[PDB]
Amino acid sequence: RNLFDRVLHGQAPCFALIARSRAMIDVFAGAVSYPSSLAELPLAAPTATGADRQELLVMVPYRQLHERGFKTHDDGAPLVAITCDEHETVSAQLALAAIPDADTALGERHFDIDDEAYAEIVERVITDEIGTGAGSNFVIKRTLEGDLDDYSPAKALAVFKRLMRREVGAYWIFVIHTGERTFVGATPERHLTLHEGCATMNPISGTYRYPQSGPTIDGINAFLGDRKESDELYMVLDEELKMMARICPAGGQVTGPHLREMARLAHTEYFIVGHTEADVRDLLRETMFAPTVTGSPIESATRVIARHERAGRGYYSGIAALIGRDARGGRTLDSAILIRTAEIDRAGHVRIGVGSTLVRHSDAVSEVMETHAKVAALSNAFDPPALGQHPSVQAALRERNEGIADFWFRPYGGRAELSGCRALIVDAEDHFTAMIAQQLSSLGLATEVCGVHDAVDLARYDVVVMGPGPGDPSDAGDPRIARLYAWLRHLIDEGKPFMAVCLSHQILNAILGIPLVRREVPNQGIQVEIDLFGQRERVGFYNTYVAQTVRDEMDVDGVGTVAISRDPRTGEVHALRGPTFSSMQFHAESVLTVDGPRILGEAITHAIRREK
Amino acid sequence: RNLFDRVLHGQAPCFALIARSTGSAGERAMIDVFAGAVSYPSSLAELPLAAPTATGADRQELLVMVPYRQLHERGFKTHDDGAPLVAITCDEHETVSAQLALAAIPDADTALGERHFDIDDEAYAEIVERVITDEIGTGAGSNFVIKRTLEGDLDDYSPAKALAVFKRLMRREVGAYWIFVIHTGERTFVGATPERHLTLHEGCATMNPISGTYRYPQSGPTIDGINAFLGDRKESDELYMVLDEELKMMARICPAGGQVTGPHLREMARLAHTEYFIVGHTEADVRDLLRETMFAPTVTGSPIESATRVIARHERAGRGYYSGIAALIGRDARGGRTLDSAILIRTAEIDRAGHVRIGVGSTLVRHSDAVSEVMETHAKVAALSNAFDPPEAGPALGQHPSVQAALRERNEGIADFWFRPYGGRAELSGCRALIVDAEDHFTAMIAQQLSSLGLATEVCGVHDAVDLARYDVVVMGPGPGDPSDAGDPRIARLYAWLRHLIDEGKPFMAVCLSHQILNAILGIPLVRREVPNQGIQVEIDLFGQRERVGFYNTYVAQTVRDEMDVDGVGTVAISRDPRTGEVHALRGPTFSSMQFHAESVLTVDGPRILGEAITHAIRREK
Ligand SMILES: [Mg+2]
Ligand SMILES: [Mg+2]
């Protein structure tokens, strides 16, 4: 059982998961202590083991600034040091799949200082501090607050998980649990890195708030052309250059700037690199805390912060530092600024600090909106933010079943005059015939299906049904179509009761001397209200060619008088009723036909009229 | 999870991963993982199927891929492209948790090279118009599907790459009936199909006619869009037609016929479909059921036999497995026949070469509009296509040339010094300077720049006690606060320093706060700027020379005078804004001062300007 599994099952009372820079997660565990100063951090003498090794994970709280002679609201937040007794790496994707989900909804979720209040403080800082020469820029914290129910670290694991899957452009994504306090966050900004004497800082400032609909090229350009935003960045550049001038004898060298893209916002940024050989404790002490989260000049910024924030800061604007050794015993520092981070206590009470760099041309409502944008990804990580399930859609779907065939919706189990009658169904290459058989069956007929070329004894049946099919009914050069002409001529001649459907209805019309025409707009898969021998019916059509006539009755040699149901406007024929037969252009069997079985029954009843 | 890891390391040459729909509401997704031997029967009659057996548990026997060509078993015409009936014996079968599996699947470049449709949009539209006019319009039938093929080439193709596409598909696509990758040795299938072909469980047969397509806007689906779609006559007719056609098929395989339920909206990642279900009862042999249901009308047309005729007339190419069936054949715990089958649409066939074929069509009806049907094919292929070539993989907003340019502009016309390599970067050459810090570490930046000019430097605090004989120039630093606030102990102390320097004739350069105090000492008035100059670059006239300099100040000295005589000092020259009287710099007999920060990243040519300040301050020294 690796360390990460032990962390997952609560076997590690003190641990850290840190996703830095397959993406890998660093997994740490060991002993907690709370030393009294940065001087007293438990660091051993130098040793090179032949590989990189982390020694201490340290959380520096805002109050630590006492070590620099600066005033803070002292809230007792300890300097935390966790000895990296164990350290493994696990694949980010694998880890996340192992992490169980959890309800991490924030209860009684609100800011300690609301928008109107925060806006008044912003204005005050601009007028009374920047406007009286206290400095050029300042960051004033406020705190998003909430309560997790049944809090345990597993819930922090769940938030870490969503953060990893949803947030982008972070420098560190992490969850650090010390025993009494849990930190979860996705910070964009390193505090200070140190590798082989090369120190790096990352002054970040300037913020583009993504619209709900997503970032745009126009939005970004307008931001990159905003004087306020540009000045903001140069100011923290300058401030961080002072810091680098202090810890690095030859000073810093700027590179950049870059656009850091995150999930809800984008930032502008520069990098500063320089050389230093100072002790890591000194470097930490002397860089408390980045100007991007305090202000400038720094000592005056702490004064200003104390004047306008009634509460202490906890770890907000503080540092999480990984202190370690390279293969050859050289000092290494990877540290990040504790912003975009939640502090959770044993009770489940969640504090998320957030501020903004206030400048002489800051607009207060924007800075308010900027704080919302900054907490947005973390906040979503706690409380993540259907068309089918919409009542308009549910309604429109239900409408599809109104005014179509009831039969086909009835349970295939439970669904006189004709009961007992034997029918033969002749298939013209369209399995609509199988549907015709089922419906005739439901009327009490016994039924049998065969093909057009098959040789059949026509004494075993009371009524013959001439089925539908593809093609042009005028096409006697199609052997199948010619074959159907033969069948119908034979049925008519013999006086055998029959019902012709669609293609065969058409053929019958030709045989009786009624013209066939092609419809310009075909009637292929359409339900139509028609007068069927004096009764409104709604029926399904699947035809392109149609019989056309001006006559409502026609007298035909070798047959007798045939009644014709037609459209009076167009002359299009829907059905024939002859002395010994009936026919339909439409498909009674179709889902598009209403009361198909009734209609077929009336068709059959009529066809067998001279029998009795 | 050993069958899966073996699949992962090349140790199952023939396998399938199939993510099926079964799973109860509040359960992890699971993936079925199969492996065994490939065979190629000559017919459905001859599928390698054993006599009935029961083990007390469900068991899969065969995974079968039925190609379009197989329609010859029904006497229907087909362009014969040799696509074989493929049967894979389910020798091994395990299930893995989808999330764990997917995490284990390595990513890969699966970009499709030389990506194109074999029949382009204009061409395809002409074929669509033709079918409507010449087929539907001459009584061949009511509706028809005509295939075209999205084509491309995977580089360095191996099945790992197929696993990668399957992975993204699992992550991105929704509303699929099966999401799968099937690898036979010689051919690989990857897809996300929405449509079962036929299921069979305890004699209960089910089909799922789907047709009608709402294409999601690039912006995302809307309620209005859906309603407009659900009210479209073309689309609702389309679905009723395909319903009728599947009812016929069910009437043939089920003695008592089929029973309709629905309709429903199936929501996918890029589109939504309307759908019905039909259920019924049958006891036919699975081979007979597969044979008689070749192939769904939703992907062929109607009437079926005429549809195959129409398809043959308008497609040059054979269909491969497009519109075919992927069938899991098996037994329930007590020996009854089991069938789970899916329609091979929204699927890629990859050959051993890496060449990829994705068949796609649309249901053509009398009121089809040809350009819409073109767009419909794009929407249908869109999820799969994205599984190969994701959108997020494309260039970042940040890499846009307007952004690259605006960032680059931030470095024009500011301090070159701070961008120069740190180690890196006559007349002041020997000179020793003392920098007095007034609570602003701009002093460390002044030190660096002075140093770069050849001065030796030392930084101290305002309250520190020093021997000034050890230095040639003193620099009186900047800091916070109001320069008129002589009741502030720090500010009082700056006044004392400057009085002392002036009185001693000791060369000095005053910066910002100290520049301001020096102005007070010389009798020049101090004011609060209405608009503060805190963090700003400004072009100024500095003793007759245009400079661009960085300001960090709120208060300023003001005067009408360009030069003034001051008692105990001498003649002081003043560089000021001629419009407002704001003082930027002083040049005295023994000193110089600046309101601005020469050392700032906002100042152009800072070191030069410092050098000139220093050069001037020391002008009486020898
Ligand atoms: Mg800002
Ligand atoms: Mg369609």
Taking the CA of residue B305 and the nearest CA in chain A, the distance in Å comes to 7
Burial class from Cβ neighbours inside 10 Å (0-12, 13-18, 19+) for residue A500 reads: buried
CA distance A77 to A313: 9
Please indicate if the annotation marks A275 as binding a ligand.
Answer: no
Closest residue of A to B479, CA-based?
A297
Q: Is B15 helix (H, G, I), strand (E, B) or coil?
A: strand
The rounded Å distance from CA B229 to ligand 2 centre is: 11
Q: Are A440 and A600 in contact (CB under 8 A)?
A: yes
Cα–Cα distance, B420 to A254 (Å, whole number): 8
Crossing angle (nearest 10°) for helices A479-494 and A503-511: 60
Distance in Å from the first CA to the final CA of chain B? 87
Cα–Cα distances (Å) from A503 to A367, A492, A519, A599, in that order, read 76, 16, 14, 18
Contacts of A522 in chain B (CB under 8 A): 136-137, 139, 366
Confirm if B220 and A386 have CB atoms less than 8 A apart: no
Ligand nearest to the CA of A204: 1
CB contacts, 8 Å: B553 with chain A: 133
Helices B442-452 + A227-247 axis angle, to 10: 70
The residue written with tokens 């960032």 in the block is B407
Residue A177 annotated as binding site: no
**DSSP for B287-344, written as a single string:** HHHHHHT-S-GGGSEESHHHHHHHHHHH-SS--TTTT-EEEEEEE-TTS-EEEEEEE-
| Long-range contact set of residues B482-491: C-beta below 8 Å, sequence gap at least 24 | B482/A132, B482/A133, B482/B555, B483/B513, B483/B516, B483/B517, B483/B519, B483/B520, B483/B526, B483/B555, B484/B520, B484/B526, B484/B555, B490/B438, B490/B439, B490/B462, B490/B463, B491/B517
CB atoms within 10 A of CB B473: 27
* Token code pair at residue A251: 């000073």
In this structure, whether the domain defined by B431-622 belongs to CATH 3.40.50.880 is answered with: yes
CA A490/CA A81 separation, integer angstroms: 103
CA quadruple B49, B55, B56, B57: dihedral sign: negative
Q: How many helices (H) and strands (E) does chain A have?
A: 14, 32
Directed axis angle between helix A391-399 and helix B223-230, to 10°? 10
The number of angstroms, rounded, from the C-alpha of B63 to the middle of its chain's C-alpha atoms is 36
User: Nearest by CB to B139, which of A392, A409, A544?
Assistant: A544
Contact (CB<8Å) B248/A432: yes
| Domain residue extents for chain B | 1-391, 431-622
CATH class entry, domain B1-391: alpha beta
Question: How many residues would you count in chain B?
Answer: 622
| Residue B109, CA atoms < 13 Å, CB-side half-sphere | 7
Place of tokens 């850290």: A16
SS3 at position B90? coil
Q: Which residues of chain A make contact with B532, given a CB cutoff of 8 A? A: 130-131, 133, 360
Best mutation target, B397, B459, B462, to test chain A (most A CBs within 10 A): B397
- B364: β partners: B144
Residues of B known to be catalytic: 512, 597, 599
Beta carbons of B599 and A245 less than 8 angstroms apart: no
For A421-612, CATH gives 3.40.50.880
Q: Cα-Cα-Cα-Cα dihedral of B334, B339, B340, B346, to 10°?
A: 170
d(CA B480, CA A299): 9
Of B365, B403, B418, the CB nearest to A220: B403
Maximum separation of any 2 CA atoms in chain B, in Å: 121
Environment class of B232 (CB within 10 Å of its CB; exposed 0-12, middle 13-18, buried 19+): middle
Taking the C-alpha atoms of residue B110 and residue B249, their distance in angstroms, rounded to an integer, is 39
Pairing verdict, β A498-501 and A446-451: unpaired
Distance of CA B427 to the CA centre of its chain: 57
Which ligand neighbours the alpha carbon of A374 most closely? 1
| Structure solved via | X-ray
Residue closest to A88 by CA, chosen among A155, A174, A7, A150: A7
**A569 Cβ contact list (under 8 Å, min separation 6):** none
Residue A551's nearest CA partner among A561, A560, A538 is: A561
Residue A122 contacts residue A357 (beta carbons within 8 Å): no
How many degrees, rounded to 5, is the angle at CA B564 between CA B559 and CA B567? 120
CATH number of A1-385: 3.60.120.10
Residue in the structure block whose two tokens are 């305090």: A294
Interchain pair A542, B104: CB under 8 A: no
Q: Which of A234, A438, A470 sits opposite B251 (nearest CB)?
A: A438
Task: State how beta strands B187-193 and B178-183 pair.
Answer: antiparallel
d(CA B274, ligand 2 centre) in Å: 10
* Three-state secondary structure readout of A425-483: EEECCCCHHHHHHHHHHHCCCEEEEEECCCCCCCCCCCEEEECCCCCCCCCCCCHHHHH
Please give the order of strands across the beta sheet that includes B143-145: B301-302, B143-145, B363-364
Nearest to B398 among A248, A259, A524 (CB): A259
Give one DSSP letter per residue of A228-287, joined into a string: HHHHHHHHHHHHHHHHHHHHSTT--EEEEEEEEE-SSEEEEEEEEEEE----HHHHHHHT
Among A549, A559, A558, A429, which Cα is nearest to A484's? Answer: A429
Give the Å distances, CA to CA, from A351 to A87, A147, A178, A314, A340: 28, 9, 16, 9, 11
Closest C-alpha to B432, from B471, B468, B467, B476: B471
Distant-in-sequence contacts of A363-367, Cβ < 8 A, 24+ apart = A363/A228, A364/A119, A364/A120, A364/A122, A364/A123, A364/A126, A365/A119, A367/A118, A367/A119, A367/A122
> Quick one: which ligand is closest to A235's CA?
1
| Distance of CA A363 from the midpoint of ligand 1 (Å) | 10
Q: Which of A14, A248, A421, A502 is catalytic?
A: A502
β-pairing verdict for B86-89 and B59-66: antiparallel
Nearest to B303 among A135, A430, A590 (CB): A430
Nearest Cα of chain B lies from the Cα of A196 at a distance, in angstroms, of 16
Neighbours of B538 (CB within 10 A): 15
Q: Which of B103, B138, B223 has its CB closest to that of A392?
A: B223
Q: Which of A162, A258, A400 to mutate to test the interface with B (most CBs of B within 10 A)?
A: A400
Q: Å from A42 to nearest chain B CA?
A: 30
Binding residues of B for Mg(2+): 238, 376
Chain A CB contacts of B263 below 8 Å: 397, 400-401
Beta carbons of B608 and B555 less than 8 angstroms apart: no
Residue B15: asked if its preceding bond is cis (omega within 30°), the reply is no
Q: How far apart are the first and last CA of chain A?
A: 89
Question: B396: number of CA atoms within 13 Å, CB side?
Answer: 13
**CA of B345, nearest ligand number:** 2
| Backbone dihedral angles phi then psi of residue B611, each to the nearest 5 degrees | -60, -40
Q: Is B481–A133 a contact, with Cβ atoms under 8 angstroms apart?
A: yes
Q: Mark out the alpha helices in A99-178 (DSSP H runs).
A: 115-128, 153-166
Q: Nearest C-alpha of chain A: how many angstroms from B67? A: 23
Q: Which of A125, A258, A383 is nearest to B410 (CA)?
A: A258
Give me the catalytic one of A191, A267, A587, A606: A587
d(CA A103, CA A382): 8
Contact B230 A135 (CB under 8 A): no
The residue whose two tokens read 């390599």 is B421
Q: Which of B429, B440, B437, B522 is nearest to B472 (CA)?
A: B429
Q: Find the A591 Cα to ligand 2 centroid distance in Å.
A: 19
Asked if residues B274 and B211 have their Cβ atoms less than 8 Å apart, the reply is: yes
Q: What is the DSSP letter of B558?
A: B
User: Most A CBs within 10 Å: which of B239, B282, B534, B600, as the mutation test of the A interface?
Assistant: B534
Residue B214: beta bridge partners?
B272
Q: Choose among B538, B546, B586, B540: nearest CA to B562.
A: B586
Q: Which residue of B has its CA nearest to A392?
A: B227
What is the number of CB-based contacts under 8 A between chain A and chain B? 286
Tokens of B343: 């329609």
What is the rounded distance in angstroms from the CA atom of residue B227 to the CA atom of residue B239?
Answer: 16
Smallest CA–CA distance from A94 into chain B, residue: B103
Would you tell me how many other CB atoms lie within 10 Å of the CB of residue B401?
7
**Helix (H/G/I), strand (E/B), else coil: A358:** strand
Residue B599 · residue B614 · CB < 8 Å: no
Whether A237 sits inside 8 A of B272 (CB atoms) is no
Q: Is the peptide bond before B427 cis (omega within 30 degrees of 0)?
A: yes
Q: Residue A366 CA: which ligand is closest?
A: 1
CB atoms within 10 A of CB B411: 15
Q: C-alpha distances in angstroms, A411 versus A401, A406, A408, A599, B258?
A: 16, 11, 8, 21, 8
Percent of chain B as helix, strand, coil, to the nearest 5 = 30, 30, 40
Q: In this complex, do A261 and B447 lie within 8 Å of one another by their Cβ atoms? A: no
Which entry of A55, A589, A602, A606 is annotated as an active-site residue? A589
Between chains, do B410 and A258 touch, taking CB under 8 Å as contact? no
Q: How far apart are CA A551 and CA A45, in angstroms?
A: 113
Binding residues of B: 238, 322, 346, 361, 376, 380, 512, 552, 597
Mutate to test the interface with B, among A524, A526, A542, A543 (most CBs of B within 10 A): A524
What's the B145 CA to ligand 2 centre distance in angstroms?
A: 9
Contacts of residue B610, defined as CB under 8 A and 6 or more positions apart, other chains included, come to B446, B449, B450, B453, B509, B598, B599
Distance of CA B607 to the CA centre of its chain: 45
Of B259, B410, B424, the CB nearest to A230: B410
Cα separation, B371 vs B126, in Å, equals 10
Q: Which residues of chain A neighbour B103 with C-beta distances below 8 Å?
A: 91, 93-94, 96-97
